[PDB]
Amino acid sequence: MLSPKAATLAERSAGLAFSLYQAMAKDQAVENILLSPVVVASSLGLVSLGGKATTASQAKAVLSAEQLRDEEVHAGLGELLRSLSNTWKLGSRLYGPSSVSFAEDFVRSSKQHYNCEHSKINFRDKRSALQSINEWAAQTTDGKLPEVTKDVERTDGALLVNAMFFKPHWDEKFHHKMVDNRGFMVTRSYTVGVTMMHRTGLYNYYDDEKEKLQIVEMPLAHKLSSLIILMPHHVEPLERLEKLLTKEQLKIWMGKMQKKAVAISLPKGVVEVTHDLQKHLAGLGLTEAIDKNKADLSRMSGKKDLYLASVFHATAFEWDTEGNPFELRSPKLFYADHPFIFLVRDTQSGSLLFIGRLVRPKGDKM
Numbered sequence: 418m419l420s421p422k423a424a425t426l427a428e429r430s431a432g433l434a435f436s437l438y439q440a441m442a443k444d445q446a447v448e449n450i451l452l453s454p455v456v457v458a459s460s461l462g463l464v465s466l467g468g469k470a471t472t473a474s475q476a477k478a479v480l481s482a483e484q485l486r487d488e489e490v491h492a493g494l495g496e497l498l499r500s501l502s503n504t505w506k507l508g509s510r511l512y513g514p515s516s517v518s519f520a521e522d523f524v525r526s527s528k529q530h531y532n533c534e535h536s537k538i539n540f541r542d543k544r545s546a547l548q549s550i551n552e553w554a555a556q557t558t559d560g561k562l563p564e565v566t567k568d569v570e571r572t573d574g575a576l577l578v579n580a581m582f583f584k585p586h587w588d589e590k591f592h593h594k595m596v597d598n599r600g601f602m603v604t605r606s607y608t609v610g611v612t613m614m615h616r617t618g619l620y621n622y623y624d625d626e627k628e629k630l631q632i633v634e635m636p637l638a639h640k641l642s643s644l645i646i647l648m649p650h651h652v653e654p655l656e657r658l659e660k661l662l663t664k665e666q667l668k669i670w671m672g673k674m675q676k677k678a679v680a681i682s683l684p685k686g687v688v689e690v691t692h693d694l695q696k697h698l699a700g701l702g703l704t705e706a707i708d709k710n711k712a713d714l715s716r717m718s719g720k721k722d723l724y725l726a727s728v729f730h731a732t733a734f735e736w737d738t739e740g741n742p743f744e745l746r747s748p749k750l751f752y753a754d755h756p757f758i759f760l761v762r763d764t765q766s767g768s769l770l771f772i773g774r775l776v777r778p779k780g781d782k783m
Contacts, residue, residue: 423496429481430454431769440697451690451732451773462494467717472705479702495530506582508557510534517720540572554580561733574726581732587740588636591616602652602755610781611684621674648757678748684778687735694728
């Protein structure tokens with residue numbers, strides 16, 4: 418159980434995660450989305466720790482923590498981060514140019530609250546800068562996320578890299594042999610070859626006949642958290658369903674869910690997703706930190722015009738059969754052969770661990 422300050426922070430982190438998801442969803446260039454509320458919030462936390470003036474005040478403002486002491490914010494976020502590690506691999510590293518020396522004070526507090534790593538890189542050798550970043554992320558995730566980016570767009574600033582590996586462990590496992598090859602319809606005209614895992618059990622279920630979708634809750638190990646899937650009836654873009662995706666609607670839907678026999682089929686595999694949150698952070702209210710001529714990160718370094726060039730949110734999410742061990746002849750069918758939205762929620766608190774969408778699984782494009 419979290420402190421009231423850490424609990425209030427957690428609420429805002431999900432509010433932020435939804436706002437971020439929506440922003441990205443609007444980008445036609447975006448396919449799969451994968452966001453960890455807390456990791457996003459700790460990126461803003463780092464800006465507040467590293468910044469001065471509106472640069473830092475905006476970070477607290479996006480986090481709706483303006484009525485909290487700076488240390489109360491860092492403590493709370495650091496609490497929430499620690500609460501995640503008790504299947505889960507997380508690394509945080511700040512990359513600055515070779516010419517930039519990080520402030521001892523900043524290094525101390527960032528390591529203390531955010532478990533932030535610091536490294537100097539040289540983008541005069543792009544192959545080596547990239548190799549460093551990718552190698553670091555690969556070790557952090559033990560190879561699950563081998564590459565974070567193929568290119569570093571902006572080289573005049575600081576690079577925040579968050580490498581993650583998450584693997585939901587079912588409270589009732591899928592049988593290791595209940596796996597076969599199936600087509601996943603990315604669009605009505607494009608099918609990719611995937612491996613599907615199949616299982617029938619009692620699950621919290623809701624079929625919204627009015628808004629043409631299905632909602633299922635798959636509890637994770639020891640019912641401490643659960644995975645919720647929202648899938649439209651038809652093979653269609655997630656645009657329509659995303660318009661309904663609000664905190665309030667989600668609450669309405671969950672109230673309507675009841676424990677029924679459900680035949681769940683999911684694409685089995687690792688989904689590697691890398692986001693550069695920098696573009697969407699300006700949209701959330703973090704306008705100064707991300708501009709060379711606006712940014713003030715003087716508490717972080719003192720180097721002329723250092724600004725936050727990138728915020729890499731790279732995640733390897735694995736859908737596997739593994740989970741805990743141990744009427745049903747006519748179950749409701751929940752066959753995920755087209756794009757769906759998913760959430761990971763902490764059972765006890767209601768806090769959002771993850772928000773994302775699966776649009777293109779890793780597989781053989783037919």
